[PDB]
């Protein structure tokens, strides 16, 4: 998609192997925010969004938190608390042609900046002056979009880059987990544990708590996890800390 | 510590960086104290037809520790099947040239 009209793909209920992407030699940019790229396969998310678009090389830096510019402000905005990875590669051999590829547009003018993950695809004439345009472009009345006109002979900063942004949502049962192999469930022992991304240390015992069909875990008055629903057996387990005390 | 990398990778020679060089070739610590000095050597380290004497590590099982120097050439396993020293599908030669 064009960056002004970026394409959002929703990913859920699947196994996400992020090492295939990270360990690839084919990407020029792979920057993760709010998460380490080498820990992704140990995590579980409630949703993943893969946002795809084309921008020019020099604009790749704008696809990040805390950035400004024509892309960051008018086309594709990422939040300051963004969690996810921005992956990009040179696509000069795909998205460029002799004479110029004018199928890739970006928004050049807008009344105001975009909100995070806002998608504005309008083509209404932009009023730069004080006089109403009435839909007619001309002096102080601009057509809001412009083409990159990608050419195979352009310098790197003006070559097309295909960008995929993977946003990781952490609300809700986690539905997108890395390719980690599960182990046998062990009770009445002091163990480390990871229940669908929920990690900690303690002793697992059978719970007598009346969990409702939609509830995945519980908390005590300290607002900390004290019970979980086993993601495979749907057994409810109570969590207590391993014996400790002063000496 | 002296070495050759390509222009775009110079930014990777710093604390808090990631990338093929920062992760698999030359890693600097987050508490690094020192100076990173670089200059263009296009008139020394380039030749017509390509200079293939400068290699970098493209694949590795894990990231390097600060000031770790890995010079092995063992085949990298990308898949689940053992390579047994033979490169091919899902089995890569870990180094590549800048040319």
């Amino acid at each position, epitope marked *: 998609a064009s960056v002004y009209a970026w394409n959002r793909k929703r990913i859920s209920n699947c196994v996400a192997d992020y090492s295939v992407l990270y360990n690839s*030699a084919s990407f020029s940019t792979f920057k993760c925010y709010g998460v380490s790229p080498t820990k992704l396969n140990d995590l579980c998310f409630t949703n993943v969004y893969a946002d795809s678009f084309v921008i020019r090389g020099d604009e790749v830096r704008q696809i990040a938190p805390g950035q400004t510019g024509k892309i960051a402000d008018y086309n594709y905005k990422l939040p300051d608390d963004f969690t996810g990875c921005v992956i990009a590669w040179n696509s000069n051999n795909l998205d460029s042609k002799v004479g110029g590829n004018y199928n890739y547009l970006y928004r050049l003018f807008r009344k105001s900046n975009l909100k995070p993950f806002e998608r504005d695809i309008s083509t209404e004439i932009y009023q730069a002056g004080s006089t109403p345009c009435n839909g007619v472009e001309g002096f102080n009345c601009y057509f809001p979009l412009q083409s990159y006109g990608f050419q195979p002979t352009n310098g790197v900063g003006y070559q097309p880059y295909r960008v995929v942004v993977l946003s990781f949502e952490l609300l809700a049962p986690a539905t997108v987990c890395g390719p980690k192999k599960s182990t046998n469930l062990v009770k009445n022992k002091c163990v480390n544990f990871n229940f669908n991304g929920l990690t900690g240390t303690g002793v697992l015992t059978e719970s007598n708590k009346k969990f409702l069909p939609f509830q995945q875990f519980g908390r005590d008055i300290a607002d900390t996890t004290d019970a979980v629903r086993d993601p495979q057996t749907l057994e409810i387990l109570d969590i207590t800390p391993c014996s400790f005390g002063g000496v | 510590d002296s070495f050759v990398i390509r222009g775009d990778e110079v930014r990777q020679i710093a604390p808090g960086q990631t990338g093929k060089i920062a992760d698999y070739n030359y890693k600097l610590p987050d508490d690094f104290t020192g100076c990173v000095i670089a200059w263009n050597s296009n008139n020394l380290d380039s030749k017509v037809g*390509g200079n*293939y004497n400068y290699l970098y590590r*493209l*694949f590795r099982k894990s990231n390097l520790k600060p000031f770790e120097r890995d010079i092995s050439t063992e085949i990298y396993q990308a898949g689940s099947t053992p390579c047994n020293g033979v*490169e091919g*599908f899902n089995c*890569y*030669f870990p180094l590549q*040239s800048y040319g």
Partner: antibody
Amino acid sequence: VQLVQSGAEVKKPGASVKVSCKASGYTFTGYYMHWVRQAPGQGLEWMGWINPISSGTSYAQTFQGRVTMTSDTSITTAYMELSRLRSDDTAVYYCARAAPFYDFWSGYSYFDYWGQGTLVTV
Amino acid sequence: IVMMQSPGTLSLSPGERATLSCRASQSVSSSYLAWYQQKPGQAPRLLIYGASSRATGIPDRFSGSGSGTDFTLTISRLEPEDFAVYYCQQYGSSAWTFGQGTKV
């Protein structure tokens, strides 16, 4: 991207032939160099490949044991040496470029550049 | 694997459309299917890769499609330079296989 092969050769049965392929316009070690044979009136047959960065090879079972592939990165040239030539090895030999197996978008599955065919008569 | 093209010979006037078929003895990933064009006295050149993607320098008159065991190459309008031998090529099991080729 250009691939330039050696001239035609004429050999007697039992002889060996070495066909070169000089590459230019790209990073030589960034690609696999494949060899493909075409006997007169026949289609294309894949022989094998070499990876110049490590001089690693793989051969089709048809040629394995007869063909040795080598390369020299200093002159960005690949070589294919076919030993124990038989009369049925009369063919046009091509060198062709393909991405390495680590290419994300499967550029290794096909050959994007070809040199001029080199005829070997046996 | 066996890659079988059909018809062995195709003949029609310039300006018209030609369809070239390639069938596999077993399923072939679309990503691993390519088409080549070989003119008389010349080396093969890549036209289509990944079943449908055009190679650089290839006219939009050429297109490909297919999946499983049935792939095709379409030439929407034939020019004098299109009357050559076309091949389908498959990758798998760490080997590259070509069809017998068909002549337009």
